[PDB]
Amino acid sequence: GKIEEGKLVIWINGDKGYNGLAEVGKKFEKDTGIKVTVEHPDKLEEKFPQVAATGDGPDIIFWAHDRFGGYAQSGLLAEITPDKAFQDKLYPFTWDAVRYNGKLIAYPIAVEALSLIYNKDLLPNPPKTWEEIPALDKELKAKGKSALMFNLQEPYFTWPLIAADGGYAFKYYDIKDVGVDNAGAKAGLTFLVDLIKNKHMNADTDYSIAEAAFNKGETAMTINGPWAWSNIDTSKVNYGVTVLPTFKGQPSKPFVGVLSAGINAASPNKELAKEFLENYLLTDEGLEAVNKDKPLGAVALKSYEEELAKDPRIAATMENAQKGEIMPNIPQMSAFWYAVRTAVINAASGRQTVDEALKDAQTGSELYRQSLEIISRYLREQATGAADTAPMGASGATSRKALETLRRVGDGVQRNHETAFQGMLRKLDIKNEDDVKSLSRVMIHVFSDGVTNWGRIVTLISFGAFVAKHLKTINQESCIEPLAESITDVLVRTKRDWLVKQRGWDGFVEFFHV
Ligand SMILES: OC[C@H]1O[C@H](O[C@H]2[C@H](O)[C@@H](O)[C@@H](O)O[C@@H]2CO)[C@H](O)[C@@H](O)[C@@H]1O
Ligand SMILES: CSc1ccc(O)c(C(=O)O)c1
Ligand SMILES: [Mg+2]
């Protein structure tokens, strides 16, 4: 392979205690004589799938658990196999966060939730509601201070307000039912936008700016997680950590993350990685070394959490976590976050209205499942000759009309391209599940080139139907669903922006109408 044998390379995000983690690596190195290297690459969560796909990258990847389902689905993670005794050392619900399709795909490290952090010298009694913050900012501005600054560039930080009055990601998971465009989400984001319009916040505020402002005593409040407490300690700001404000009488609902460590499927060092994670890091001493660098939050290791739990900052973290919800770990989470990130930034800046911004995020978040519903149904009915009688469910009008349109347009495409498809198939030689995998790379290569239009998309899906018919004929009907998922994957990740701009499959229906 490409990853070196007999050594460990670990990647972790730059806002975490990577120096403390390096200490743990040194202790492992001292015992074993085996080199451990801790790195904190930029855009880590995007770099890992890029390099791991080629069979390269680190032996161990750290991130919140929401990204790991996508990694596992893409074949990038090893199943982990802790023995019963080790599993019993960590809280069951932390294991639940890293279970994907019935398998454990990472070691859980710690539970993270955003809290309200406030400067007790400026604001001894922090607001219980978001609604009182405009007036509070006016009081503070007279003193040369501001009420609240937090990172507006990452949707993680604005999510608790969006979800407060009823916004949600995926309905508990139906990846076709998304709640980012409902009345509650709209209310939450509008309030944020109004704060900006009324000069109580600045749309350009990012993590570094908000952190510097709070730690310099310029703003009374910020929103952040336990990793941020170390830098505040150093600043000597007199701070407290408490429950997030309510919105319209409802608790803010942070998305709860479990910091987790996965093992690269391509690593020749899986046993070394196991040893390091189970017997060095996930121990009282290992977590303490990391926690002393940047606080982890409520750790997954029971023995050590019983100590941390006595910390009021940790109690506050858990209180907020209990009002929030554990993030899904499904593969669509990345698309969801990118969609909502764009919506918040565009609404904040005025590039889009709140309504249009959240509409696009809805469409972006539902795109994979909506597309899969259509493509899967088309391929299966083409292969078998009979339609699926199951109700379409959520956004059923769109799915149904898109499928109707696809049948009508696809009929001609398959008829006209029949000879071309026969030739393509003979060259590719798709005979089983392994072949459909290889087919993906070919498609991502050819489909990326040239002007995008609905005609070309129908041709891609029509070839899919042609291949599905073939798979059925040679008694490989089980390969049709992974074929549909592969085509959907290619479509959605090469044409995402285009598709959202067309308003997804609604654009498709309108384009070919009558
Ligand atoms: O903003 C979307 C982003 O949110 C979460 O990332 C958090 C992470 O969980 C925290 O540990 C800390 O590093 O802050 C991040 C936000 O900047 C999701 O885990 C992540 O996948 C998502 O993109
Ligand atoms: C298997 S490559 C392929 C198949 C059908 C198509 O329509 C396209 C394309 O349009 O790029 C590519
Ligand atoms: Mg739109």
3-state secondary structure labels for all residues of 430-475: CCCHHHHHHHHHHHHHHHCCCCCCHHHHHHHHHHHHHHHHHHHHCC
The DSSP H or E segment spanning 214 is helix 207-215
Residue 144 alpha carbon to ligand 3 centre in Å: 40
- The three-state secondary structure class of 241 is strand
Residue 235 alpha carbon to ligand 1 centre in Å: 24
Ligand 2 pocket check for 414: Cβ under 6 Å: no
Q: Are 179 and 168 in contact (CB under 8 A)?
A: yes
Q: Are 40 and 13 in contact (CB under 8 A)?
A: yes
Q: How far from 386 is each of 3, 25, 71, 378, CA to CA, in Å? A: 48, 58, 35, 10
The token pair at 457 is: 């998309």
Residue 293 alpha carbon to ligand 1 centre in Å: 19
**Which ligand 2 atom sits closest to the C-alpha of 463?**
5
DSSP 8-state assignment for residue 280: I
From the CA of 454, which ligand is nearest?
2
Using alpha carbons only, what angle is made at residue 218 by residues 216 and 220, rounded to the nearest 5 degrees? Answer: 110
CA distance 213 to 352: 28
CB-defined site of ligand 1, < 6 Å:
13, 15, 45, 64, 66-67, 112, 154-156, 257, 337
Burial of 124 (0-12, 13-18, 19+ CB in 10 A): exposed
Ligand 2: which of 414, 447, 488 to mutate, most ligand atoms within 8 Å of CB?
447
- The three-state secondary structure class of 478 is helix
CB atoms near residue 144 (< 10 Å): 7
Burial of 110 (0-12, 13-18, 19+ CB in 10 A): buried
Ligand 2 pocket check for 483: Cβ under 6 Å: no
Residue 459 alpha carbon to ligand 2 centre in Å: 7
**CA 166, 168, 172, 173: dihedral to nearest 10 degrees?**
160
Under CATH, which architecture does the 333-512 domain have?
Orthogonal Bundle (1.10)
**Which ligand 1 atom sits closest to the C-alpha of 259?**
11
Angle separating helix axes 354-384 and 396-428, nearest 10 degrees: 50
Q: Hey, which residues does 242 pair with through a beta bridge?
A: 116
From the CA of 504, which ligand is nearest?
3
CA distance 62 to 364: 26
From the CA of 110, which ligand is nearest?
1
Helical H segments across 296-332, by residue range: 302-308, 312-323
Q: How far from 26 is each of 270, 275, 276, 280, 287, CA to CA, in Å? A: 18, 14, 11, 10, 14
Spatial CA neighbour of 378 closest among 410, 423, 355: 410
Spatial CA neighbour of 162 closest among 200, 191, 125, 126: 191
CA distance 221 to 122: 9
Torsional class of 443: left (φ above 0), alpha (ψ -120 to 50), beta (otherwise)? alpha
Helical H segments across 98-203, by residue range: 133-141, 155-164, 183-197
Residue 499 alpha carbon to ligand 3 centre in Å: 10
Cα within 13 Å of Cα(40), Cβ side: 10
The DSSP H or E segment spanning 145 is none
Sequence length of the chain is: 514
The token pair at 165 is: 């009055």
The DSSP H or E segment spanning 495 is helix 480-501
**What resolution in angstroms does the PDB record give?**
1.9
Residue 464 alpha carbon to ligand 2 centre in Å: 9
Q: Are 169 and 116 in contact (CB under 8 A)?
A: no
Experimental method: X-ray
CA distance 313 to 73: 36
The DSSP H or E segment spanning 75 is none
CA distance 490 to 482: 12
CB atoms near residue 42 (< 10 Å): 8
Burial of 313 (0-12, 13-18, 19+ CB in 10 A): middle
Residue 441 alpha carbon to ligand 2 centre in Å: 11
Ligand 1: which of 156, 229, 344 to mutate, most ligand atoms within 8 Å of CB?
156
The token pair at 507 is: 């654009």
**CA 80, 83, 89, 93: dihedral to nearest 10 degrees?**
50
Ligand 2: which of 463, 483, 494 to mutate, most ligand atoms within 8 Å of CB?
463
Residues 6+ apart with CB under 8 A from 254: 113, 114, 159, 160, 244, 320, 321, 323, 324
Q: Are 342 and 336 in contact (CB under 8 A)?
A: no
CA distance 415 to 346: 44
DSSP 8-state assignment for residue 248: T
Spatial CA neighbour of 190 closest among 358, 307, 302: 358
Torsional class of 156: left (φ above 0), alpha (ψ -120 to 50), beta (otherwise)? alpha
At position 145, the amino acid (one-letter code) is: K
Spatial CA neighbour of 381 closest among 293, 292, 481, 284: 481
Give domain 115-255's CATH superfamily: Periplasmic binding protein-like II (3.40.190.10)
Among protein residues, the one whose CA lies closest to atom 23 of ligand 1:
337
Spatial CA neighbour of 88 closest among 291, 282, 321: 282
The DSSP H or E segment spanning 61 is strand 60-64
DSSP 8-state assignment for residue 327: P
From the CA of 356, which ligand is nearest?
3
Using alpha carbons only, what angle is made at residue 37 by residues 31 and 38, rounded to the nearest 5 degrees? Answer: 115
Residue 460 alpha carbon to ligand 2 centre in Å: 5
CA distance 15 to 151: 13
* Residue corresponding to tokens 């709140």: 354
Tell how strand 8-11 and strand 36-39 pair up: parallel
CA distance 317 to 296: 11
Q: How far from 248 is each of 165, 209, 245, 252, 340, CA to CA, in Å? A: 7, 28, 10, 10, 22
CA distance 215 to 89: 36
Ligand 2 pocket check for 442: Cβ under 6 Å: yes
From the CA of 491, which ligand is nearest?
2
Cα within 13 Å of Cα(94), Cβ side: 25
Q: Are 348 and 191 in contact (CB under 8 A)?
A: no
CA distance 122 to 439: 61
Tell how strand 255-263 and strand 60-64 pair up: antiparallel
Ligand 3 is an ion; residues with CB less than 5 A from it: 360
Ligand 2 pocket check for 332: Cβ under 6 Å: no
CA distance 97 to 298: 14
Ligand 2 pocket check for 420: Cβ under 6 Å: no
At position 100, the amino acid (one-letter code) is: Y
